[PDB]
């Protein structure tokens, strides 16, 4: 028949695991001839995983930090991309407020149904590919890498284990490069800057990164994993079968059975050390901006772990003049940097953008109509020295990349759109 | 074996036809009786469809006129509501460009599934409905109707009288307001101010005119129905076989088989006058924004309708300063209202909005991380004093709101959000 | 100012709870006045929900019982209510297994996206008004009502009472007439004849059945409550911590926390009479089709709630004829509408007559080409003395019906779809 | 900064196109460089549409002729693989009918979202992958492939070239094998069997079929192209534009300005003639099932292009035994692959199997209840004999696939699904 998509023998996904420095210090409870009994006898590749993981695990080692802001549409990629961002942040919680599957609005509880951050990591990646495409008829090189790795939001799996594996998979359809998994009861899931929070035990989260990293590997695919903790606020968690988490277990029991439990940055530094061998990155969510606590942090999981990298949410969940001062605004990610925080994001950069834009625009519309509209038109060719480009809307969004597609099949068209355009009359 | 949604008698529907204001100089070709045959046993109510349509009628005569901005996410509507806005566009460009359901990012050529504008549609309904609920447990008042009306894209209808007529259908289903169909031959749809524009004959057009207001009535809503022509800039025509349109005929033919149609306000104007009986407002495109151009446009179907009520883009594709001054461009829509032109929006503002603003914000967090945030986030806290509450992103997505879900089924639930998050704490 | 959709007060909602016999021995937790402070200031009419709702209702008092097979697709349901059916039963077993918005084959354990269920309920709700609209002009009287009632499956809630809310949020959206909630934990839940079931605490599916109803109620519309309990097979548990399960609790625990607890009839016993007042029907999950256990339950059941109605679960999962012989199979369901079994259901129906079906088509195909596929065809037309309509495919999916509305909007149209047709000239 | 999918040049595209034989009678009116100018900087790897092409290719080459039925859920191309049949056949009919994006049922008119049947060429893959893992853990080695190569229908395009070019790109993406696009006008396009047809002019069908040789070239996959013609029947085309159509056109015209055009095996033959360096496979739909106009057809066509292959459409929209003796049944597809057609399907295969075996149980079931259920199950377990798998369903759908996966998370997990099931026990 076809030898399209063999999977690779138990031998060769050994010897990767044992030679490539990608896998250096990763653990896998489970064995190669593991992987291979999942794959069936046709391994779909999954081109901008491979790519996007790829390159993402690079730039982690050679830029000083790797930073994004969260991306909500694929034109929020876009422009990200098109100002100079290396990376793309795919938060769950811009998905729950304004773009899941349910249509509705939410709170960032799970609510929303689980293949909704795929769809969005899709979406990114056509976005981008159209960027691409347009920037090559153009002859637009600018930017360099269009295709920005996607780190996207894996919340609390929605579930079990299988649940974990069926996102991971998902994400990697998609074209995912890297995802993350926090230790919360999914069925109780908040931010990690709201309150209600419930752990789940440590070796319980253990499983999630251990599935999280099957899925990859059965999809064959290099994904950077993330596990994040939740440990510093949450005084919830649901059992205290794990000795590792015994020692804050303090007895006291809600109605619902869950056990108190005491919260800080020492669990986490614990839960930290737990989870490093199955995590290429380690984030801690906090209550304030601090560079200190994120040095105390930092600093003790080093100690074990010299090696692990580390991540960072600059959240807009911080009033962030309330607690620091323009210097060290100015200075924070540089110095998180340095402390080996390689990957740092604004989680809901989108949702702020998008909410506060048009509700600037509005406003002024309301009061003085096309006046209003025409600052931003202003605006906007102002910054076309800056590189803006999306001025021209009608090339930007492909125009004139479907022209050249309609004169490729038939270059007599009387029917292509650029030609006669008011752009090409008026800008 | 129920009464519930039992259809209407003819003679019922056929006296609303005869008595209601609203259905003044509206022209139906089909009988009532051929409307109850397409019910069934049962007709859904469609609530939102039916207020909608109900409130846009009575602002368009009550208003002076009704603007809007187009909305391509439900957090953009809820936004433009918050600024005061009283009326959604819902523009199929924005929907192309960075929200249909292919995933992809498209010129504006008929290329997206046909559902994607219901999809939208039905989720800024879903997102003012949030925001409706959370003022209501908020006690805010500030906004008198969360549920602004909207009016959405319908095309060329992506195909025959049949495809139209399904389209329509579901726009109503997700609960619009009104709906738009302009006179472009479908597998060829262009935006209005791209070239290769092909129109159809002018009986087809009212074949469409009429496939719409028949879904509204199987519906049993009173959608508001606006017809567009995009005869202004075609030079293109599928048929000569309608003597209506023979006048503009050169004989020139193309080598798809299409004929050559002399352009401008004239063909315009004769095209509204045939669908004025069949259409709420009628819309002309145009290729700049002309007031002097707009009054010879009005006053010409109006010699004919004179009630005839009007609509007018105010369309980002026109470079507005490189033909307007200042002082025109801030009387430009109260001027055109006098013309009767009540319905007046800006079609991609969304687009603009989104990629401008996260343009800006990347831009900046690429050279300065996180001060280029800090500075939106200290813009929002200002914008507080114009009614901005998105600031407070948690409660702005309903976490209150679900918090009240949760105690209202368990009052002493430990899980609930709001308390003990930094919104609550440093906000 | 519109009164279109206008809530109602909390005292009418408080008189039609005291007055209407629909809510004779329902207890609510909350009260009307939190019903209608979730409710903000519009509410759409659900037509589908509220007519199906009541129909199930009266069936459910006015036929010895209600049987119902599972539908996965819409045609499936359209060929139950024709062949003489009076209620669909919508199978999440079904759903995962091959009609689940992931677009994966999944076994029956919660893994599909939550709002996979809500949509098949509108889909099924569509092929029924098709039907419905296609009967009424053919003059087809054959079936009195085409909107037979959807009883549907809403699992573990995916996750916590928020989940739960908005997954029959959704069914309820979609026309649902009921929906039912099993004491499993999501994370881990299985179909009741699988192994490895978690049950949750008594008050944890209390508050489930609490949130079901409320959604219900703040969606205003009487949607039919079902309680599954899987305690008869499962021997885990999360928690001890509700009284009423301790007695069957070991003490025994998993390295994941659960509790080992003592399976069998009497804690389905004791958590039917904890859920009777707040279920309408109330269901207990069995190894084997026994008329004497379900004799047990029922006897133990009623003697405290006598008028309590229960669902019983003809399950393809047993092996009939292995434990049964034909004349006790023949007489099963009259059997258990004796002892007040009124909805049961064979929840796997469209699994295996689509599978069964497709399998002996396509090997006769194999072997003797269209000799296989003219025995279909000729089994279709002999099914027509018993009602079969579906050999004449064309007018079964409504191109009759589109015809109707092609010559409503052109009565001259040259281009309608069953005149001159190959079903018209060969049918 | 990545050799991941780094399109080939130019001179690599021309070479395959100059050597490889599956290009041999292939025109391209275009170019290897404008290939490469539409590619963008990386390109996706298609896997399943590229093995399955592949597949398909070599299959109309190696047997005797290549058969199948439509498919419209993924259990039934499993089951038709499972019986012996090496591909499936995606009808457009079926999607309409009760499986496309709208959730609506249609007559065969291009109502549906033009995705929809990308959604069940990923579904059946999808469907095909599980029993393929299923299969390798089970060490069942019974199917040789159970990645069948697909081939889908394309309808008329949903518009002009570049709504051809989107469907072919997604048709692809999804891991199609083949697609076939028919010269009808899209907006108004019917099933082959219904009338009202209008055919578009020779020539557009060629830019459709350019258009879809292009993206299957941009998306580096050897998509198998069929072309249908709808001329045997069609007595209405668009236009007289091209003078291979005029020696048909009559003069008349309808009052849309259709032109009425002679209709038969005539036009047909010159269609397929002019199609041939573009199509892969050709179509002509047909009044009737006939040997001796197929062999007409046939003989007609390869005494120009003696290689070109042939599909034919088996339809259950013809009465069969009305027109045919059993014998003739018994040998029409061997028959045919004598002529060339290499390609056999019955599109509506699923739609009557689907709707037949329902309404029979459901008839049963609502006379006897269990016994007419007890009927089916008994036949399933005499299919066991046969190869039929589907009798313990849980495994069917992945039971033990996904008890693999948690027990590589966690071998000693106690909440894993086959051990303790009634499957386990009573099958
Ligand atoms: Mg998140
Ligand atoms: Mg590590
Ligand atoms: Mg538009
Ligand atoms: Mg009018
Ligand atoms: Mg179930
Ligand atoms: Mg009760
Ligand atoms: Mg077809």
Redesign the interface.
């Known amino acids: 028949?076809?030898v399209?998509?063999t999977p690779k023998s138990a031998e060769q996904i050994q010897q990767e695991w044992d030679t490539n420095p990608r896998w250096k210090d990763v653990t896998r409870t489970?064995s190669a001839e593991?992987v291979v009994?999942?794959?069936?006898?046709?391994?779909?590749?999954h081109?901008?995983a491979?790519?996007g993981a790829?390159?993402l695990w690079?730039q982690l080692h050679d830029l000083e930090w790797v930073?994004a802001?969260g991306?909500?549409?694929?034109?929020?990629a876009?422009?990200?991309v098109?100002?100079?961002?290396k990376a793309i942040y795919l938060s769950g919680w811009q998905v729950?407020?304004?773009?899941n599957?349910?249509?509705?609005?939410?709170?960032?509880?799970?609510?929303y149904?689980?293949?909704?951050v795929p769809?969005v990591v899709?979406?990114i990646n056509?976005?981008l590919?159209?960027?691409?495409?347009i920037a090559?008829?153009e002859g637009d090189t600018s930017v360099?890498?269009?295709?920005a790795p996607i780190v996207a939001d894996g919340e609390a799996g929605?579930?079990?284990?299988?649940?974990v594996?069926?996102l991971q998979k998902?994400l990697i359809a998609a074209g995912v490069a890297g995802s993350h998994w926090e230790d919360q009861l999914?069925?109780?899931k908040?931010?990690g800057?709201?309150?209600?929070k419930?752990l789940i035990?440590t070796?319980?989260h253990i499983?999630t990164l251990?599935?999280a990293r099957?899925a990859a590997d059965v999809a064959d695919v290099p994904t950077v994993v993330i596990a994040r903790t939740d440990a510093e606020?949450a005084t919830?968690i649901?059992?205290?079968?794990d000795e590792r988490d015994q020692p804050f277990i303090t007895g006291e029991?809600?109605?619902?059975?869950?056990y108190r439990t005491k919260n800080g940055i020492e669990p986490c530094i614990a839960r930290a050390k737990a989870y490093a061998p199955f995590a290429d990155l380690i984030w801690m969510e906090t209550?304030?901006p601090d560079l200190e606590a994120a040095r105390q942090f930092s600093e003790a999981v080093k100690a074990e772990y010299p090696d692990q990298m580390l991540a960072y949410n600059?959240?807009?969940?911080?009033?962030?003049?309330?607690?620091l001062d323009?210097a060290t605004?100015?200075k924070?990610?540089?110095e998180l940097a340095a402390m080996g925080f390689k990957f740092?994001f604004?989680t809901?950069?989108?949702?702020?953008?998008?909410?506060?834009?048009?509700?600037?625009?509005?406003?002024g519309?309301?009061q003085?109509?096309?006046?209003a509209?025409?600052e931003?038109?202003?605006?906007?060719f102002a910054?076309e020295e800056?590189?803006?480009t999306?001025?021209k809307?009608?090339r930007?969004?492909?125009?004139g990349?479907?022209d050249?597609?309609?004169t490729?099949?038939?270059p007599?068209?009387?029917?292509?759109?650029?030609?006669?355009?008011?752009?090409?009359?008026?800008?």
């Open positions: 028949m076809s399209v998509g489970y593991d009994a999942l794959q069936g006898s046709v391994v779909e590749e081109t901008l491979r790519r790829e390159v690079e930073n802001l991306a909500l549409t694929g034109n929020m876009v422009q990200q098109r100002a100079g961002l729950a407020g304004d773009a599957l349910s249509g509705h609005t939410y709170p960032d509880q799970s609510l149904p689980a293949n909704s769809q899709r979406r056509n976005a590919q159209r960027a691409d495409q090559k008829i360099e890498n269009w295709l929605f579930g079990g284990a299988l649940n594996y069926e998902a999914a069925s109780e908040k931010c800057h709201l309150g209600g419930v035990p070796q319980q499983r251990t599935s099957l606020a919830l649901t059992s205290d079968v029991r809600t109605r619902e059975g869950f209550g304030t600059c959240s807009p969940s911080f009033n962030w003049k309330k607690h323009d605004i100015a924070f990610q540089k740092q604004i809901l950069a989108g949702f702020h953008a998008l909410n506060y834009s048009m509700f600037d625009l509005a406003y519309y309301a003085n109509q096309m006046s509209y025409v931003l038109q202003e605006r906007e910054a800056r590189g803006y999306a001025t809307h009608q930007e969004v492909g125009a990349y479907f050249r597609i309609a490729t099949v038939d007599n068209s009387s029917t292509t759109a650029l030609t006669g355009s008011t752009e090409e009359g008026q800008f």
